[PDB]
Short mmCIF file of N, CA and C and ligand atoms in Angstrom, two decimals:
data_model
loop_
_atom_site.label_atom_id
_atom_site.label_comp_id
_atom_site.label_asym_id
_atom_site.label_seq_id
_atom_site.Cartn_x
_atom_site.Cartn_y
_atom_site.Cartn_z
N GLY A 1 48.53 23.88 43.05
CA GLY A 1 47.83 22.98 42.71
C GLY A 1 46.34 23.49 42.34
N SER A 2 45.57 23.55 43.60
CA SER A 2 44.14 24.34 43.46
C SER A 2 44.54 25.73 42.46
N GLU A 3 43.50 26.08 41.68
CA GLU A 3 43.31 27.39 40.83
C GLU A 3 43.84 28.71 41.92
N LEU A 4 42.86 28.65 43.10
CA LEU A 4 42.99 29.62 43.99
C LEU A 4 44.55 29.68 44.44
N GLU A 5 45.15 28.59 44.65
CA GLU A 5 46.51 28.68 45.02
C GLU A 5 47.43 29.25 43.84
N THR A 6 46.99 28.97 42.72
CA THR A 6 47.69 29.53 41.14
C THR A 6 47.44 30.91 41.35
N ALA A 7 46.38 31.61 41.77
CA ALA A 7 46.34 32.89 41.87
C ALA A 7 47.07 33.46 42.90
N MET A 8 47.27 33.14 44.01
CA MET A 8 47.90 33.47 45.25
C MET A 8 49.20 33.41 44.85
N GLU A 9 49.88 32.34 44.04
CA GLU A 9 51.28 32.13 43.60
C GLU A 9 51.55 33.22 42.52
N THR A 10 50.53 33.72 41.70
CA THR A 10 50.69 34.73 40.68
C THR A 10 50.93 36.10 41.43
N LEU A 11 49.80 36.36 42.45
CA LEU A 11 50.33 37.54 43.14
C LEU A 11 51.69 37.69 43.64
N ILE A 12 51.85 36.41 44.26
CA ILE A 12 53.38 36.32 44.95
C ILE A 12 54.38 36.60 43.64
N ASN A 13 54.22 35.89 42.58
CA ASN A 13 55.14 36.22 41.54
C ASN A 13 55.28 37.41 40.88
N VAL A 14 54.03 38.03 40.91
CA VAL A 14 54.19 39.58 40.24
C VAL A 14 54.90 40.66 41.24
N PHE A 15 54.41 40.36 42.63
CA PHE A 15 55.15 41.28 43.66
C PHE A 15 56.36 40.98 43.70
N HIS A 16 56.94 39.66 43.76
CA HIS A 16 58.43 39.21 43.60
C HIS A 16 59.10 39.76 42.45
N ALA A 17 58.25 39.84 41.24
CA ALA A 17 58.90 40.31 40.00
C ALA A 17 59.48 41.74 40.09
N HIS A 18 58.45 42.33 40.72
CA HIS A 18 58.84 43.76 40.65
C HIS A 18 59.87 44.23 42.02
N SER A 19 59.38 43.95 43.19
CA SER A 19 60.20 44.04 44.38
C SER A 19 61.25 43.43 44.20
N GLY A 20 61.62 42.07 43.68
CA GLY A 20 62.55 41.44 43.33
C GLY A 20 63.50 41.98 42.59
N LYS A 21 62.54 42.44 41.05
CA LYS A 21 63.59 42.85 40.06
C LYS A 21 64.15 44.30 40.66
N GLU A 22 63.76 45.02 41.20
CA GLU A 22 64.50 46.34 41.66
C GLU A 22 64.39 46.50 43.03
N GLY A 23 65.48 47.18 43.65
CA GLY A 23 65.41 47.74 45.07
C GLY A 23 65.46 46.29 46.07
N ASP A 24 64.80 46.49 47.28
CA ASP A 24 64.56 45.61 48.16
C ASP A 24 63.66 44.74 47.54
N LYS A 25 63.89 43.36 47.88
CA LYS A 25 63.10 42.11 47.42
C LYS A 25 61.79 42.44 47.94
N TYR A 26 61.35 42.65 49.00
CA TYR A 26 60.34 42.81 49.79
C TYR A 26 59.77 44.15 50.09
N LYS A 27 60.22 45.07 49.30
CA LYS A 27 59.53 46.59 49.35
C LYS A 27 59.38 46.87 48.03
N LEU A 28 58.13 47.75 47.89
CA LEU A 28 57.83 48.41 46.42
C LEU A 28 57.90 49.81 46.81
N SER A 29 58.73 50.40 45.58
CA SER A 29 58.86 51.90 45.42
C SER A 29 58.11 52.47 44.54
N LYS A 30 57.99 53.79 44.47
CA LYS A 30 57.31 54.55 43.64
C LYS A 30 57.25 54.09 41.87
N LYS A 31 58.86 54.24 41.75
CA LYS A 31 59.22 54.09 40.55
C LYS A 31 58.71 52.48 40.12
N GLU A 32 59.20 51.59 40.96
CA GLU A 32 58.83 50.13 40.73
C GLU A 32 57.36 49.88 40.61
N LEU A 33 56.75 50.31 41.30
CA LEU A 33 55.19 49.97 41.08
C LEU A 33 54.44 50.51 40.11
N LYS A 34 54.88 51.63 39.89
CA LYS A 34 54.81 52.31 38.47
C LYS A 34 54.74 51.31 37.77
N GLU A 35 55.99 50.71 37.52
CA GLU A 35 56.00 49.63 36.49
C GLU A 35 55.23 48.37 36.86
N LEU A 36 55.07 48.09 38.00
CA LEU A 36 54.08 46.65 38.13
C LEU A 36 52.96 46.90 37.70
N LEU A 37 52.20 47.96 38.02
CA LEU A 37 50.85 48.27 37.66
C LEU A 37 50.69 48.14 36.19
N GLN A 38 51.56 48.97 35.73
CA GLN A 38 51.56 49.29 34.18
C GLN A 38 51.59 47.93 33.41
N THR A 39 52.57 47.21 33.71
CA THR A 39 52.76 45.78 33.21
C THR A 39 51.70 44.91 33.46
N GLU A 40 51.24 44.78 34.62
CA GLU A 40 50.07 43.96 35.03
C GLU A 40 48.69 44.56 34.81
N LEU A 41 48.30 45.56 35.40
CA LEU A 41 47.11 46.29 34.77
C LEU A 41 47.31 47.46 34.24
N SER A 42 46.24 47.57 33.47
CA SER A 42 46.32 48.91 32.35
C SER A 42 45.18 49.71 32.71
N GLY A 43 43.88 49.26 32.61
CA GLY A 43 42.78 50.11 32.71
C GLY A 43 42.73 50.73 33.97
N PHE A 44 43.27 50.03 35.18
CA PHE A 44 42.99 50.34 36.25
C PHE A 44 43.88 51.72 36.74
N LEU A 45 44.98 51.50 36.54
CA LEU A 45 45.90 52.84 36.45
C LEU A 45 45.73 53.75 35.50
N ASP A 46 45.34 53.43 34.35
CA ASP A 46 45.19 54.11 33.10
C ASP A 46 43.83 54.99 33.37
N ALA A 47 43.01 54.36 33.95
CA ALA A 47 41.60 55.16 34.34
C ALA A 47 41.83 56.46 34.62
N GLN A 48 42.76 56.72 35.58
CA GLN A 48 43.13 57.94 36.49
C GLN A 48 43.52 58.82 35.56
N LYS A 49 44.18 58.50 34.45
CA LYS A 49 44.65 59.34 33.38
C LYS A 49 45.83 60.40 33.86
N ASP A 50 45.47 60.80 35.03
CA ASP A 50 46.69 61.68 35.76
C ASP A 50 47.96 60.96 35.78
N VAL A 51 48.99 61.80 35.67
CA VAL A 51 50.35 61.31 35.83
C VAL A 51 50.95 61.18 37.44
N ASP A 52 50.06 62.10 38.06
CA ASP A 52 50.50 62.16 39.36
C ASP A 52 49.49 61.03 40.16
N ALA A 53 48.92 60.28 39.32
CA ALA A 53 47.63 59.29 39.83
C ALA A 53 48.65 58.18 40.88
N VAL A 54 49.65 57.70 40.16
CA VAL A 54 50.59 57.16 40.92
C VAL A 54 50.76 57.23 42.18
N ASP A 55 51.37 58.56 42.47
CA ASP A 55 51.59 59.15 43.46
C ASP A 55 50.40 59.14 44.55
N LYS A 56 49.23 59.73 43.78
CA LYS A 56 48.25 59.62 44.81
C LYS A 56 47.69 58.29 45.15
N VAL A 57 47.63 57.24 44.52
CA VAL A 57 47.68 55.95 44.71
C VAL A 57 48.45 55.21 45.95
N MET A 58 49.84 55.55 45.72
CA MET A 58 50.69 55.08 46.75
C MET A 58 50.47 55.75 48.20
N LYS A 59 49.95 57.01 48.39
CA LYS A 59 50.09 57.71 49.40
C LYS A 59 48.94 56.92 50.17
N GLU A 60 47.91 56.36 49.60
CA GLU A 60 46.86 55.74 50.23
C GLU A 60 47.36 54.14 50.72
N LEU A 61 48.14 53.74 50.17
CA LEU A 61 48.71 52.29 49.98
C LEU A 61 49.92 52.37 51.45
N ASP A 62 50.33 53.36 51.43
CA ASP A 62 51.49 53.47 52.51
C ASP A 62 50.83 53.63 54.00
N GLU A 63 49.93 52.59 54.39
CA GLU A 63 49.57 52.59 55.74
C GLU A 63 50.77 52.75 56.66
N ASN A 64 51.69 52.19 56.04
CA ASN A 64 53.00 52.21 57.10
C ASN A 64 53.78 53.60 57.34
N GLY A 65 53.55 54.31 56.04
CA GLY A 65 53.83 55.53 56.09
C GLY A 65 55.36 55.76 55.79
N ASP A 66 56.04 54.82 55.43
CA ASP A 66 57.50 54.75 55.08
C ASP A 66 57.79 55.36 53.95
N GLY A 67 56.81 55.85 52.99
CA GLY A 67 57.06 56.37 51.64
C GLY A 67 57.35 55.36 50.60
N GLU A 68 57.07 53.82 51.22
CA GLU A 68 57.15 52.95 50.32
C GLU A 68 55.88 51.91 50.42
N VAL A 69 55.43 51.42 49.37
CA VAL A 69 54.51 50.50 49.17
C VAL A 69 55.05 48.97 49.74
N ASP A 70 54.47 48.24 50.71
CA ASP A 70 54.82 47.03 51.19
C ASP A 70 53.84 45.88 50.64
N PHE A 71 54.54 44.71 50.59
CA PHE A 71 53.78 43.47 50.21
C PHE A 71 52.37 43.66 50.54
N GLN A 72 52.60 43.82 52.04
CA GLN A 72 51.01 43.73 52.46
C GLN A 72 50.06 44.76 51.93
N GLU A 73 50.39 45.92 51.74
CA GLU A 73 49.65 47.05 51.39
C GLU A 73 49.45 46.61 49.56
N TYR A 74 50.10 45.97 49.08
CA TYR A 74 50.17 45.47 47.77
C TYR A 74 48.99 44.77 47.40
N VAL A 75 49.24 43.76 48.40
CA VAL A 75 48.18 42.55 48.67
C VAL A 75 46.89 43.13 48.82
N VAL A 76 46.54 44.01 49.87
CA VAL A 76 45.32 44.73 50.01
C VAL A 76 44.95 45.21 48.80
N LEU A 77 45.90 46.11 47.87
CA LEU A 77 45.22 46.73 46.81
C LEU A 77 44.75 45.75 45.66
N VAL A 78 45.43 44.76 45.50
CA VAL A 78 44.93 43.70 44.44
C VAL A 78 43.56 43.30 44.90
N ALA A 79 43.41 42.66 46.39
CA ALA A 79 42.48 42.21 46.46
C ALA A 79 41.11 43.08 46.84
N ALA A 80 41.40 44.31 47.29
CA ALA A 80 40.39 45.41 47.53
C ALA A 80 39.86 45.69 45.91
N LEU A 81 40.92 45.74 45.02
CA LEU A 81 40.77 45.93 43.65
C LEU A 81 39.73 44.69 43.00
N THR A 82 40.14 43.61 43.54
CA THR A 82 39.50 42.41 43.08
C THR A 82 37.89 42.06 43.44
N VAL A 83 37.53 42.74 44.58
CA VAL A 83 36.33 42.59 44.98
C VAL A 83 35.61 43.78 44.27
N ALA A 84 36.30 44.96 44.21
CA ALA A 84 35.82 46.11 43.55
C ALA A 84 35.40 46.05 42.32
N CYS A 85 36.27 44.97 41.93
CA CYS A 85 36.27 44.59 40.18
C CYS A 85 34.88 43.88 40.14
N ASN A 86 34.69 42.60 40.70
CA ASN A 86 33.53 42.05 40.58
C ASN A 86 32.42 43.22 40.92
N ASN A 87 32.51 44.02 41.67
CA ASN A 87 31.39 44.75 42.01
C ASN A 87 31.03 45.73 40.63
N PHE A 88 32.20 46.00 40.10
CA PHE A 88 32.25 46.76 38.86
C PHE A 88 31.36 46.06 37.88
N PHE A 89 31.83 45.12 37.64
CA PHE A 89 31.25 44.04 36.52
C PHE A 89 29.46 43.82 36.93
N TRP A 90 29.22 43.25 37.74
CA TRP A 90 27.91 42.97 38.22
C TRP A 90 27.16 44.38 38.47
N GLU A 91 27.79 45.14 39.39
CA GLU A 91 27.08 46.52 39.73
C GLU A 91 28.00 47.35 38.73
N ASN A 92 27.01 48.67 38.63
CA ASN A 92 27.51 49.70 37.75
C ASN A 92 28.94 50.34 38.52
N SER A 93 28.84 50.38 39.80
CA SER A 93 29.94 51.02 40.43
C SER A 93 30.86 49.65 40.98
N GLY B 1 43.61 39.04 30.72
CA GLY B 1 44.58 39.49 29.90
C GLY B 1 46.24 39.26 30.57
N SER B 2 46.57 40.12 31.55
CA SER B 2 47.85 40.05 32.44
C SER B 2 47.69 38.96 33.42
N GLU B 3 48.54 38.07 33.86
CA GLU B 3 48.41 37.39 34.73
C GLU B 3 47.86 37.78 36.14
N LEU B 4 48.27 38.99 36.37
CA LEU B 4 47.96 39.47 37.89
C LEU B 4 46.32 39.20 37.85
N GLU B 5 45.67 39.70 36.61
CA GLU B 5 44.48 39.99 36.22
C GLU B 5 43.97 38.45 36.04
N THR B 6 44.39 37.68 35.67
CA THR B 6 44.02 36.40 35.65
C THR B 6 43.65 35.68 37.24
N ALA B 7 44.71 36.28 38.05
CA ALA B 7 44.74 35.69 39.50
C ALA B 7 43.39 36.41 39.91
N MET B 8 43.22 37.74 39.52
CA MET B 8 42.10 38.41 40.23
C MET B 8 40.78 37.75 39.46
N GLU B 9 40.73 37.24 38.50
CA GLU B 9 39.70 36.50 37.71
C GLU B 9 39.34 35.23 38.59
N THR B 10 40.51 34.80 38.97
CA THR B 10 40.39 33.09 39.56
C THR B 10 39.76 33.55 41.02
N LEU B 11 40.11 34.68 41.81
CA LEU B 11 39.51 34.74 43.07
C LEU B 11 37.89 35.08 42.50
N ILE B 12 37.72 35.89 41.78
CA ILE B 12 36.27 36.23 41.46
C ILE B 12 35.70 34.64 41.17
N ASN B 13 36.27 34.01 40.43
CA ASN B 13 35.53 32.84 39.68
C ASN B 13 35.36 31.85 41.15
N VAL B 14 36.35 31.74 42.07
CA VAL B 14 36.20 30.78 43.11
C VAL B 14 35.07 31.45 44.07
N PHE B 15 35.13 32.70 44.30
CA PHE B 15 34.24 33.14 45.40
C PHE B 15 32.72 32.87 44.68
N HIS B 16 32.48 33.20 43.59
CA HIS B 16 31.54 33.25 42.74
C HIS B 16 31.08 31.70 42.61
N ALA B 17 32.00 30.86 42.51
CA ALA B 17 31.98 29.60 42.24
C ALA B 17 30.98 29.01 43.39
N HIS B 18 31.51 29.20 44.79
CA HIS B 18 30.74 28.90 46.16
C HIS B 18 29.61 29.79 46.18
N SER B 19 29.89 30.99 46.62
CA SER B 19 28.61 31.94 46.80
C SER B 19 27.61 31.83 45.70
N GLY B 20 28.06 31.64 44.42
CA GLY B 20 27.07 31.29 43.42
C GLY B 20 26.17 30.02 43.50
N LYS B 21 27.26 29.07 43.71
CA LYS B 21 26.72 27.70 43.88
C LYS B 21 25.61 27.39 44.84
N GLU B 22 25.84 28.06 45.93
CA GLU B 22 24.83 27.67 47.07
C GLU B 22 24.35 29.20 47.69
N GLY B 23 23.24 29.27 48.23
CA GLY B 23 22.60 30.38 48.78
C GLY B 23 22.82 31.78 47.94
N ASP B 24 22.99 32.92 48.50
CA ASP B 24 23.12 34.31 47.92
C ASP B 24 24.47 34.19 47.01
N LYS B 25 24.36 34.58 45.86
CA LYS B 25 25.56 34.66 45.19
C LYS B 25 26.99 35.85 45.62
N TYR B 26 26.34 36.77 46.32
CA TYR B 26 27.53 37.44 47.05
C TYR B 26 27.68 37.36 48.48
N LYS B 27 27.07 36.24 49.05
CA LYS B 27 27.45 35.95 50.38
C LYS B 27 27.91 34.77 50.64
N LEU B 28 28.58 34.48 51.69
CA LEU B 28 29.24 33.02 52.03
C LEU B 28 28.86 32.55 53.19
N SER B 29 28.31 31.41 53.34
CA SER B 29 27.97 30.97 54.65
C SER B 29 28.83 29.82 55.32
N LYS B 30 28.88 29.49 56.17
CA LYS B 30 29.77 28.44 57.13
C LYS B 30 29.72 27.16 56.34
N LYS B 31 28.76 26.70 55.88
CA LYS B 31 28.60 25.55 55.27
C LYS B 31 29.57 25.65 53.74
N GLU B 32 28.99 26.62 53.23
CA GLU B 32 29.61 27.03 51.84
C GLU B 32 31.21 27.28 51.77
N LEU B 33 31.79 27.92 52.94
CA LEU B 33 32.97 28.37 53.20
C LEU B 33 33.70 27.10 53.42
N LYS B 34 33.19 26.54 54.42
CA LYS B 34 33.72 25.16 54.45
C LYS B 34 34.05 24.25 53.26
N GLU B 35 33.16 24.34 52.34
CA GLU B 35 33.32 23.63 51.20
C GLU B 35 34.36 24.49 50.20
N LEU B 36 34.47 25.81 50.05
CA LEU B 36 35.38 26.58 49.05
C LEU B 36 36.60 26.39 49.60
N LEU B 37 37.12 26.52 50.95
CA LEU B 37 38.31 26.54 51.23
C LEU B 37 38.93 24.96 51.09
N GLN B 38 38.08 23.78 51.39
CA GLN B 38 38.45 22.50 51.22
C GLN B 38 38.86 22.43 49.79
N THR B 39 37.92 22.61 48.79
CA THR B 39 38.12 22.60 47.39
C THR B 39 39.13 23.18 46.89
N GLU B 40 39.61 24.37 47.34
CA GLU B 40 40.57 25.10 46.78
C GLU B 40 41.91 25.01 47.67
N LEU B 41 41.71 25.18 49.00
CA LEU B 41 43.00 25.26 49.77
C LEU B 41 42.88 23.77 50.72
N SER B 42 44.03 23.38 50.74
CA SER B 42 43.99 22.12 51.62
C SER B 42 44.92 22.15 52.95
N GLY B 43 46.02 22.45 52.80
CA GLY B 43 47.08 22.52 53.98
C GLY B 43 46.64 23.82 54.99
N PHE B 44 46.14 24.91 54.24
CA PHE B 44 45.78 25.93 55.00
C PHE B 44 44.48 25.68 56.11
N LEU B 45 43.50 25.03 55.68
CA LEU B 45 42.63 24.75 56.38
C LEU B 45 42.71 23.61 57.43
N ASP B 46 43.32 22.52 56.59
CA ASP B 46 43.88 21.40 57.14
C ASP B 46 44.59 21.39 58.41
N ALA B 47 45.64 22.45 58.46
CA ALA B 47 46.59 22.70 59.08
C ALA B 47 46.15 22.84 60.68
N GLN B 48 44.99 23.29 60.75
CA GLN B 48 44.49 23.66 62.02
C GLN B 48 43.83 22.10 62.70
N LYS B 49 43.59 21.36 61.73
CA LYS B 49 43.11 19.76 62.06
C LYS B 49 41.78 19.80 63.04
N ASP B 50 41.52 20.91 63.89
CA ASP B 50 40.27 20.88 64.57
C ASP B 50 39.10 21.18 63.64
N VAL B 51 38.19 20.31 64.04
CA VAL B 51 36.77 20.51 63.12
C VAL B 51 36.04 21.70 63.31
N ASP B 52 36.40 22.41 64.35
CA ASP B 52 35.79 23.72 64.68
C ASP B 52 36.49 25.02 64.23
N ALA B 53 37.70 24.36 63.75
CA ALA B 53 38.79 25.49 63.09
C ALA B 53 37.68 26.41 61.78
N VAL B 54 36.76 25.81 61.27
CA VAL B 54 36.15 26.52 60.28
C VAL B 54 35.27 27.87 60.89
N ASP B 55 34.88 27.18 62.22
CA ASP B 55 33.91 28.31 62.79
C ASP B 55 34.94 29.19 63.44
N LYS B 56 36.11 28.77 64.04
CA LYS B 56 37.02 29.79 64.62
C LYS B 56 37.52 30.89 63.29
N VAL B 57 37.60 30.49 62.14
CA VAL B 57 38.28 31.06 60.99
C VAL B 57 37.26 32.14 60.78
N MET B 58 36.00 31.55 60.32
CA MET B 58 34.85 32.65 60.14
C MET B 58 34.50 33.71 61.09
N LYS B 59 34.68 33.50 62.47
CA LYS B 59 34.19 34.32 63.19
C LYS B 59 35.08 35.50 63.05
N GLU B 60 36.46 35.58 62.90
CA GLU B 60 37.32 36.49 62.56
C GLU B 60 37.07 37.26 61.39
N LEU B 61 36.67 36.58 60.25
CA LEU B 61 36.40 37.02 58.83
C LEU B 61 35.20 37.72 59.08
N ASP B 62 34.26 37.56 59.72
CA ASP B 62 32.84 38.49 59.89
C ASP B 62 33.16 39.74 60.50
N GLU B 63 33.95 40.56 59.87
CA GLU B 63 34.15 42.04 60.42
C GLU B 63 32.63 42.55 60.66
N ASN B 64 32.01 42.24 59.51
CA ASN B 64 30.66 42.74 59.53
C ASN B 64 29.75 42.15 60.68
N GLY B 65 30.04 40.98 61.05
CA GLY B 65 29.37 40.51 62.46
C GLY B 65 27.73 39.96 61.75
N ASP B 66 27.46 39.66 60.76
CA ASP B 66 26.28 39.19 60.37
C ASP B 66 26.24 37.76 60.29
N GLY B 67 27.10 37.07 60.80
CA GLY B 67 27.22 35.69 60.84
C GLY B 67 27.76 35.05 59.66
N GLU B 68 27.97 35.59 58.66
CA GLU B 68 28.13 35.41 57.34
C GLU B 68 29.47 35.76 56.79
N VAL B 69 30.35 35.19 55.94
CA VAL B 69 31.51 35.63 55.43
C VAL B 69 31.13 36.32 54.23
N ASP B 70 31.87 37.62 53.97
CA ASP B 70 31.44 38.55 52.67
C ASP B 70 32.59 38.55 51.56
N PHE B 71 32.06 38.72 50.37
CA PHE B 71 33.26 38.62 49.52
C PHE B 71 34.55 39.48 49.80
N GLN B 72 34.35 40.53 50.26
CA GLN B 72 35.49 41.46 50.92
C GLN B 72 36.06 40.51 51.93
N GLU B 73 35.34 40.07 52.83
CA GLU B 73 36.10 39.63 54.05
C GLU B 73 36.73 38.25 53.55
N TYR B 74 36.34 37.45 52.54
CA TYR B 74 36.87 36.39 51.57
C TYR B 74 38.30 36.96 50.91
N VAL B 75 38.13 38.22 50.38
CA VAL B 75 39.10 38.79 49.51
C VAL B 75 40.45 39.01 50.34
N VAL B 76 40.08 39.42 51.79
CA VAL B 76 41.15 39.83 52.71
C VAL B 76 41.60 38.54 53.25
N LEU B 77 40.74 37.56 53.32
CA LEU B 77 41.34 36.13 53.82
C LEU B 77 42.40 35.68 52.95
N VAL B 78 41.96 35.59 51.55
CA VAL B 78 43.15 35.14 50.35
C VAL B 78 44.15 35.98 50.33
N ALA B 79 44.07 37.38 50.29
CA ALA B 79 45.13 38.09 50.15
C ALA B 79 46.26 38.14 51.25
N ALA B 80 45.64 38.17 52.61
CA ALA B 80 46.29 38.25 53.69
C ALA B 80 47.25 36.82 53.97
N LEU B 81 46.35 35.93 53.41
CA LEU B 81 46.93 34.38 53.63
C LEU B 81 48.09 34.28 52.23
N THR B 82 47.97 35.29 51.30
CA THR B 82 48.97 35.14 50.21
C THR B 82 50.27 35.91 50.86
N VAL B 83 50.05 36.98 51.40
CA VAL B 83 51.11 37.71 51.98
C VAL B 83 52.14 36.78 52.95
N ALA B 84 51.10 36.23 53.89
CA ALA B 84 51.56 35.49 54.94
C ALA B 84 52.06 33.90 54.31
N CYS B 85 51.79 33.81 53.22
CA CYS B 85 52.21 32.54 52.44
C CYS B 85 53.59 32.55 52.13
N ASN B 86 53.78 33.89 51.22
CA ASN B 86 55.24 34.17 50.68
C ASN B 86 56.09 34.14 51.99
N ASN B 87 55.67 34.90 53.26
CA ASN B 87 56.37 35.00 54.13
C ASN B 87 56.74 33.56 54.83
N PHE B 88 55.80 32.87 55.09
CA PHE B 88 56.07 31.43 55.36
C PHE B 88 57.28 30.71 54.53
N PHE B 89 57.16 30.96 53.15
CA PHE B 89 58.22 30.36 52.21
C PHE B 89 59.51 30.91 52.57
N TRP B 90 59.68 32.12 52.40
CA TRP B 90 60.92 32.95 52.53
C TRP B 90 61.70 32.90 54.05
N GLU B 91 60.29 33.16 54.91
CA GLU B 91 60.51 33.38 56.21
C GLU B 91 59.82 31.88 56.75
N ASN B 92 60.54 31.84 58.30
CA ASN B 92 60.14 30.44 58.74
C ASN B 92 58.58 30.35 59.10
N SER B 93 58.11 31.82 59.33
CA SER B 93 56.79 32.10 59.85
C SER B 93 56.05 32.60 58.64
S1 HCS C 101 36.99 45.41 37.18
C1 HCS C 101 36.42 45.13 35.52
C2 HCS C 101 37.08 45.99 34.54
C3 HCS C 101 36.59 45.68 33.09
N1 HCS C 101 36.90 44.12 32.92
C4 HCS C 101 37.28 46.49 32.12
O1 HCS C 101 38.06 47.57 32.29
O2 HCS C 101 37.31 46.33 30.86
S1 HCS C 102 51.87 29.22 51.96
C1 HCS C 102 53.21 28.00 51.50
C2 HCS C 102 52.51 26.68 51.86
C3 HCS C 102 53.50 25.53 51.53
N1 HCS C 102 53.48 25.63 49.95
C4 HCS C 102 53.11 24.16 51.66
O1 HCS C 102 51.96 24.02 52.45
O2 HCS C 102 53.23 23.09 51.29
CA1 CA C 103 61.58 46.31 45.25
CA1 CA C 104 54.93 51.46 53.85
CA1 CA C 105 26.54 31.96 48.61
CA1 CA C 106 29.65 39.51 57.49
#
């Protein structure tokens, strides 16, 4: 209904798209996230330029420490990136 | 561009819509958030049914403790609610 909900549904749809598309529906693996960020985000992952950047990114996300990235971990990634994004736009950093 | 980005932009647009519409552009107050959640979310805030629910909700959000809700606080609210939402759909809770 509301646009905010549309956004929330979008996050659900993309997470489900990848977690659902491969492996466990509610768990995201290195290979899979590597695909989801590239398919959805370009500049964010691309900015690192490093090939091991994906590995570096996922280690931080695995608060859980199970070697996998979880929907909650992913959720904070997009949200924190969202606030950081607006900050980048208005603010230099 | 990508749908995920569209969602991120939507979160930015709604936060900015309210924080920007009233008071400080980067700070959300009780009165204002009361308006943003109702305008964007219905069932989430409505479910509490209590009138003081807004107050109860904001206290948790003010990690900062400044009596205001910040974009980052709001960001985690929608994100955590997003994962909790999908959980509600697939899962009973
Ligand atoms: S987070 C904002 C990033 C910007 N639109 C860009 O990368 O072009
Ligand atoms: S978080 C999912 C909530 C559901 N769509 C509803 O409230 O109807
Ligand atoms: Ca998966
Ligand atoms: Ca994990
Ligand atoms: Ca404001
Ligand atoms: Ca605060």
